[PDB]
């Protein structure tokens, strides 16, 4: 009787704000893409003639088709949000091209993976050769086809396309046939390969059709090794690839939702709970101040953020896009699950933190371009995509992000409206005969006004979110005072027979806070209200800040600044917090007026506004007592680590999917794993990469474990490396570096590196491959 609903994008008009800017910039980027290049893989796999070459980058190195899927979703949501005619022409054309591809094969299959029909013939026969990122020699093909399922779902739900609906059902029936001869054990083996959110999309088809066969399919596509610990409130996520898991959990939640009234299956509450526990553990233990998670795409231990503070590959944007999708699902029925009948605004505090500080920051606001990694290492920078060069996962999610800022501003519950986000907007609440405008300069000002533009004098309750970070309201010039009931996130209820012209005004008091890195190392970020602040540390060596189509072009490969050159805050955390002063002006800006080492007064602005520069979000802190020892470590060990990084020509992390894929991983009889938080690969046959040599290289460094008795032969362009390596002292965790001084410098270009056993059963387990000048 008390279900909470969301509004359609059609019903929520963004008014001038950073969000409308971001929407419009993404519109331009979406329209820049050539649909004939995005459709080319699909036509190819159907036996038709493409009209143009595919894009390059990931669209011709094995993930061919994935951006086309995202492109359907982004066009559909952007069309719902704007009604843009150019967007509709592109969406109609892409749907009709993919429909031609589907009809040419006639089975329901649509896809771009090279050799798609052969792949799925093998799978259907039970020839399943799964790795974490591969299936039968192909790059995450389940993940790829997921973006088509999702794209066709979105064309139906957002753009009302019946053609998309039929294409989606045919493609789902095709998968029923592919999996009809597979045991649950074979399915769970195949699901070891990254598969995006297929369980979610199959549950979506169940709801669209009302046919439970699609819910049985969704459950078959639910990865049990991940689900089962979550049911039991066990976080087993250390070392896992993070964006692989989040869509699975979204899927468990969606299966639970669509299964709410399924008399033949009794697990909905358990699967809902698994998702709510997953959210809790990631948000509360694995997330930084901007709302993101992971380092080099993987979950590190929650008690050790060292790599988050040292690596240039900070949180990945996809992961936050997916955590926000989950957040929206969990919030909707939070009141049903806790039998309060009011949803839990703690979900909204997270949503706001991640939306303003990560999603909004992840697009260059003027020109466009999407961020993959956001370093938390002080003094680095982030790289942006370009429309015709960049075909990354974070481009696909990037296209979607800025279409849909209207989706979570408000929620409705019969005669109740939840005012969740303080984003300028006009709402059509047709269910209660109301049109309302939210006017605010937030976060640059504290005042919010809600204006009733149209109403039918129903008694309605406005539930205004009072964030934990933030009671007098004004109605029509009259002050109404209410008692604070909790310092926690809560709602302030205001019920009236609203009429045209009524005005509700409230203020959100904003304070400076200082948020420590979660493992309580000596690094802190400044916030103002929910806004993460940052300082610009310079504009030198921003190499590849607008990416080309190269493998690895999503990473900020420019020079690493030694930490002793970046401002370090001297003193205790309360003194440091008190030393940040707000500057006068209509935009947020702050001066840091305490002691900084080395001296440059620092200016801080919102991180979402900091572009085309190096930055610090987290600052290293030093007590006056520990300064001498801290500075000596920064001047010696940290400086030397930075020098090694700055002599590095190429770098591979064996066992990490994207580093391996960017270096054209090949293998025979190989396995991967983790030891002491580091990934490896080893083989009984062999494994190989291509090294990309931008500058001549002199030295190869291989990281292994001292205790490993297995040895590798190394071939460079099929010539055995016979020079004797120098061997480093073992570190704390038992890792050593083998340093080979190459007999001849390696030429600029590409060089195969191949590892095969040297008399032993396996190669050494290799944890890092580094090429140096």
Residues that bind Zn ion (CB under 5 A): 316, 318, 393-394
Q: Is 339 left (phi over 0), alpha (psi -120 to 50) or beta?
A: left
Q: What angle do CA 414, 420, 426 make, to 5 degrees?
A: 80
The 3-state secondary structure of 525-539, one letter per residue: EEEECCEEEEEEEEC
Question: Nearer to ligand PJ5 by C-beta: 143 or 418?
Answer: 143
Backbone angles phi, psi at 445, to 5 degrees: -145, 160
Report helix, strand or coil for 732. Answer: coil
Q: Which of 725, 555, 547, 755 is nearest to 655 (CA)?
A: 755
Does residue 657 interact with ligand PJ5 by CB under 6 A? yes
Please check if 394 is assigned to a binding site: yes
Q: Which of 318, 371, 436, 473 binds ligand PJ5 (CB under 6 A)?
A: 318
What lies within 8 Å, CB to CB, of 398 at 6+ separation is 26, 317, 362, 363, 370, 371, 385
Query: Is 143 near ligand PJ5 (CB under 6 A)?
Result: yes
Q: How many residues interact with ligand PJ5 (rule CB under 6 A)?
A: 11
Nearer to Zn ion, 394 or 704 (CB): 394
Report what 690 binds from Zn ion, ligand PJ5, none; CB cut-off 5-8 Å by kind: none
- Which one, of 748, 641, 661, lies nearest residue 701 by Cα? 641
Q: Which residues, 6+ apart, have CB-to-CB distance to 736 below 8 Å?
A: 703, 704, 705, 706, 727, 728, 729, 730
Q: Nearest CA to 604 among 505, 536, 546, 697?
A: 536
Q: Is residue 472 within 8 Å of 481, Cβ to Cβ? A: yes
Question: How far apart are the C-alpha atoms of 332 and 342, rounded to whole Å?
Answer: 9
Partner whose binding site includes residue 23, from ligand PJ5, Zn ion, none (CB under 5 to 8 Å by kind): none
Give the residue with the Cβ less far from ligand PJ5, 239 or 725: 239
Please report whether residue 547 would count as binding ligand PJ5 according to CB under 6 A.
no
Q: Is 316 one of the annotated binding-site residues?
A: yes
Check residue 299 for interaction with ligand PJ5 (CB under 6 A): no
Exactly one of 74, 140, 568, 665 binds ligand PJ5 (CB under 6 A); that residue is 140
Q: Which of residues 218-247 bind ligand PJ5 (CB under 6 A)?
A: 243-244
Q: Using CB under 6 A, which of 658, 690, 699, 710 touches ligand PJ5? A: 658
Tell me the closest approach of the beta carbon of residue 282 to Zn ion, in angstroms: 16
662 is a contact residue toward ligand PJ5 (CB under 6 A): no
> Which of residues 396 and 529 has its CB atom nearest to Zn ion in the complex?
396
- Of the candidates 549, 479, 395, the one whose C-alpha atom is nearest the C-alpha of residue 60 is 549
CA–CA distance, 148 with 150 (Å, rounded to integer): 5
Nearer to ligand PJ5, 156 or 667 (CB): 667
Binders of ligand PJ5 in range 389-418 (CB under 6 A): 393
The gap between the terminal CA atoms of the chain, to the nearest Å, is 68
Instruction: Establish how many alpha carbons lie within 13 A of residue 667's alpha carbon, considering only the half-sphere containing its beta carbon.
Output: 24
Q: Which of 97/194 has CB closer to ligand PJ5?
A: 194
Element (H, E) at 34: none
- CB nearer to ligand PJ5: pick between 74 and 473: 74
Query: Contact with ligand PJ5 (CB under 6 A): which of 11, 316, 400, 662?
Result: 316
649 secondary structure, DSSP code? E
Q: Which residue is nearest to ligand PJ5 (CB)?
A: 393
Q: Hunting for tokens 């009259």 — which residue is that?
A: 478
Residue 297's binding partner out of Zn ion, ligand PJ5, none, with CB under 5 to 8 Å set by partner kind: ligand PJ5
Q: Residue 701 binds which one of ligand PJ5, Zn ion, none, with CB within 5 to 8 A depending on kind?
A: none
When binding is defined by CB under 6 A, the residue of 194, 650, 660, 662 that contacts ligand PJ5 is: 194
**Closer CB to Zn ion, 168 or 383, in the complex:** 383
Minimum distance between the CB of residue 390 and ligand PJ5, rounded to whole angstroms?
12
Q: Which does 660 bind (CB under 5 to 8 A by kind): ligand PJ5, Zn ion, none?
A: none
Annotated binding site for Zn(2+): 316, 318, 393-394
Q: Which residues bind ligand PJ5 (CB under 6 A)?
A: 140, 143, 194, 243-244, 297, 316, 318, 393, 657-658
């Amino acid at each position: 009787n008390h279900q909470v609903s969301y509004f359609s994008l059609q019903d929520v008009k963004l008014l001038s704000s950073p969000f409308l800017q971001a929407q419009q910039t993404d519109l331009h980027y979406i329209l820049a893409l050539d649909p004939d290049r995005l459709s080319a893989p699909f036509l190819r796999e159907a036996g038709l003639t493409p009209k143009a070459p595919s894009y390059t980058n990931w669209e011709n190195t094995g993930l061919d088709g994935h951006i086309g899927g995202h492109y359907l979703s982004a066009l559909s949501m952007m069309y719902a949000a704007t009604g843009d005619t150019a967007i509709y022409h592109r969406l109609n054309y892409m749907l009709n091209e993919l429909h031609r591809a589907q009809q040419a094969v006639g089975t329901g299959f649509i896809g771009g993976t090279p050799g798609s029909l052969q792949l799925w013939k093998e799978i259907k026969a039970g020839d399943i050769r799964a790795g974490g990122f591969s299936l039968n020699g192909k790059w995450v093909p389940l993940y790829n086809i997921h973006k088509t399922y999702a794209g066709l779902r979105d064309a139906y739900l957002y753009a009302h396309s019946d053609l998309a609906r039929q294409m989606l059902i045919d493609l789902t029936d095709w998968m029923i046939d592919i999996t009809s001869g597979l045991s649950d054990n074979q399915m769970q083996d195949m699901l070891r390969s990254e598969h995006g959110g297929l369980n979610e999309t199959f549950a979506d088809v169940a709801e669209i059709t009302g046919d439970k066969k699609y819910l049985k399919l969704a459950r078959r596509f639910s990865h049990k090794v991940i689900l089962d610990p979550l049911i039991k409130n066990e976080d087993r996520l250390n070392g896992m690839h993070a964006n692989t898991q989040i869509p699975k959990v979204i899927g468990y939640k969606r299966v639970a939702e669509v299964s709410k009234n399924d008399k033949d299956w009794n697990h909905a509450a358990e699967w809902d709970h698994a998702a709510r526990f997953f959210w809790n553990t990631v948000v509360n233990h694995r997330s930084v101040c901007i709302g993101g998670n992971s380092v080099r795409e993987h979950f590190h231990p929650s008690d050790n953020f060292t790599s988050m503070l040292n690596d240039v590959q900070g949180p990945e944007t996809c992961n936050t896009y997916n955590m926000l999708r989950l957040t929206k699902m969990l919030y909707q029925n939070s009141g049903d699950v806790d039998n309060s009948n009011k949803p839990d605004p703690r979900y909204v505090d997270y949503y706001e933190r991640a939306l303003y500080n990560h999603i909004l920051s992840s697009q260059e606001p003027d020109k466009g371009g999407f961020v993959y990694f956001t370093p938390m290492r002080p003094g680095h920078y982030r790289v942006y995509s370009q429309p015709e060069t960049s075909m990354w996962c974070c481009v696909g999610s990037g296209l979607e992000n800025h279409t849909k800022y209207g989706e979570f501003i408000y929620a409705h519950q019969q005669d109740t409206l939840y005012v969740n986000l303080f984003i300028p907007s006009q709402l059509n609440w047709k269910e209660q005969g109301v049109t309302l405008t939210q006017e605010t300069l937030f976060p640059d000002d504290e005042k919010v006004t809600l204006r009733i533009d149209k109403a039918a004098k129903k008694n309605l309750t406005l539930m205004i979110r009072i964030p934990e970070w933030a009671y007098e309201i004004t109605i029509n010039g009259k002050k109404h005072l209410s008692d604070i009931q909790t310092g926690a996130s809560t709602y302030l209820p205001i019920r009236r027979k609203w009429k045209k012209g009524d005005m509700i005004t409230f203020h959100l008091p904003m304070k400076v806070s200082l948020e420590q890195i979660p493992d309580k190392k000596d690094y802190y970020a400044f916030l103002y209200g929910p806004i993460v602040l940052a300082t610009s540390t310079g504009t030198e060596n921003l190499d590849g800040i607008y990416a080309d189509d190269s493998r690895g072009g999503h990473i900020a490969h420019g020079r690493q600044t030694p930490l002793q050159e970046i401002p370090m805050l001297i003193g205790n955390p309360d003194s440091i917090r008190h030393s940040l002063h707000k500057l006068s002006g209509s935009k947020l800006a702050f001066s840091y007026d305490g002691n900084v080492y080395p001296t440059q007064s620092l200016e801080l602005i919102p991180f979402f506004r900091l572009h085309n520069s190096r930055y610090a979000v987290y600052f290293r802190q030093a007590s006056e007592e520990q300064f001498k020892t801290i500075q000596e470590e920064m001047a010696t060990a940290e400086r030397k680590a930075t020098e090694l990084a700055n002599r590095t020509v190429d770098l591979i992390f064996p066992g990490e999917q994207q580093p391996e894929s960017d270096h054209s991983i090949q293998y025979e009889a190989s396995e991967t794993g983790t030891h002491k938080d580091r990934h490896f690969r080893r083989a009984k046959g062999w494994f190989s990469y291509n090294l990309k040599i931008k500058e001549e290289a002199s030295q190869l460094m291989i990281t292994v474990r001292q205790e490993d008795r297995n040895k590798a032969v190394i071939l460079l362009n099929n010539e055995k490396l016979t020079v004797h390596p120098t061997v480093s002292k073992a570190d704390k965790d038992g890792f050593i570096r083998l340093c080979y001084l190459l007999p001849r410098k390696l030429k600029v270009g590409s060089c195969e590196i191949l590892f095969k056993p040297d008399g032993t059963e396996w190669t050494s387990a290799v944890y890092e491959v580094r090429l140096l000048k």
